[PDB]
Amino acid sequence: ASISVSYKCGVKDGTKNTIRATINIKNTGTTPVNLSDIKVRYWFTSDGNEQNNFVCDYAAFGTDKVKGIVKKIENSVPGADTYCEISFTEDAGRLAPGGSTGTIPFRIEGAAEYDQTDDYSYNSEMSDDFGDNTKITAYIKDKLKYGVEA
Ligand SMILES: [Ca+2]
Numbered sequence: 001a002s003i004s005v006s007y008k009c010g011v012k013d014g015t016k017n018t019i020r021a022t023i024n025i026k027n028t029g030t031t032p033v034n035l036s037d038i039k040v041r042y043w044f045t046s047d048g049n050e051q052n053n054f055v056c057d058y059a060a061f062g063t064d065k066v067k068g069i070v071k072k073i074e075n076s077v078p079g080a081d082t083y084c085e086i087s088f089t090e091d092a093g094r095l096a097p098g099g100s101t102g103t104i105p106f107r108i109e110g111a112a113e114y115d116q117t118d119d120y121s122y123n124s125e126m127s128d129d130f131g132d133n134t135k136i137t138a139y140i141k142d143k144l145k146y147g148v149e150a
Pocket residue numbers: 044045046047114115116117118119
């Protein structure tokens with residue numbers, strides 16, 4: 001069982017209190033994987049924002065099947081004092097070998113203005129197309145399968 005994630009940095013704007021980005025999850029192995037077994041983590045510094053809410057903009061199987069929770073990290077490291085963990089509900093479906101979700105655009109919103117230039121998972125060089133951003137991590141059943149942590 002293996003997966004990859006590809007990533008495009010959001011438009012930039014506009015609104016300084018919104019992190020926007022789009023990911024695509026691909027099954028690169030030889031067996032089907034249920035979406036409900038997959039987690040994606042986006043690692044960042046919340047910059048004093050105590051509240052950080054996740055919103056899913058669009059997903060092919062429905063935005064009501066994408067869940068996000070944002071958690072503070074106890075032992076913070078450079079580039080991450082907070083991560084957003086994206087997961088799927090049991091009815092999101094499954095990815096056959098070679099299958100991919102296509103674009104899932106999302107946003108993380110705060111009450112104050114983020115500085116995305118000190119966020120580990122941010123890569124401003126991937127604005128114009130999807131790239132392989134290995135500063136975003138992904139898991140199958142809680143085992144790391146893509147990217148490099150923290
Ligand atoms: Ca930050």
